[PDB]
Design a protein around this ligand. Structure first.
Ligand SMILES: Cc1cn([C@H]2C[C@H](OP(=O)(O)O)[C@@H](COP(=O)(O)O)O2)c(=O)[nH]c1=O
Ligand SMILES: [Ca+2]
Length: 129
């Protein structure tokens, strides 16, 4: 897999951001994760976490997997990195997302995320508390 440049246009929520990719605005949906919706428990905290992470980053990168690059809603499907740290992984490690939506051919980082989830669960973090 390869990291490619993008620039933040707007944080949206725990699962998505508006990013400029190849000079075109796009909603990106994070691969392999599910954050609570804003009206659910830890939903606001997941959105706040991603917002800070991406807004504070000097460099945003997107990493597509081997399979579908866009979903049925026209959202890009990627691993998102903020100054080299994967936001997808960071969310799961803090118990602000579950590993979810694991489809064959778009699951390169599945085991990394599951390890992170196991640690959040062991620590009884946020969703796991
Ligand atoms: C994360 C992800 C979601 N999606 C689709 C499946 C779900 O369809 P449905 O909308 O029919 O439930 C939806 C979940 O996204 P959200 O969790 O952002 O709603 O997005 C994919 O198709 N591929 C993916 O990798
Ligand atoms: Ca969601």
């Amino acid at each position: 897999l390869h990291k490619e440049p993008a620039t933040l246009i707007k944080a949206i929520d725990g699962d998505t951001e508006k990013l400029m990719y190849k000079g075109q605005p796009m909603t990106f949906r994070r691969l392999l994760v599910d954050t609570p919706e804003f009206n659910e428990k830890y939903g606001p905290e997941a959105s706040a976490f991603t917002k800070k992470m991406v807004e504070n980053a000097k460099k945003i990168e997107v990493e597509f997997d081997k399979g579908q690059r866009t979903d049925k809603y026209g959202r890009g499907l990627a691993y998102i990195y903020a100054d080299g740290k994967m936001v997808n992984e960071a969310l799961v490690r803090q118990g602000l997302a579950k590993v979810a939506y694991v489809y064959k051919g778009n699951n390169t980082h599945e085991q990394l995320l599951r390890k992170a989830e196991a640690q959040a669960k062991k620590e009884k973090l946020n969703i796991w508390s």
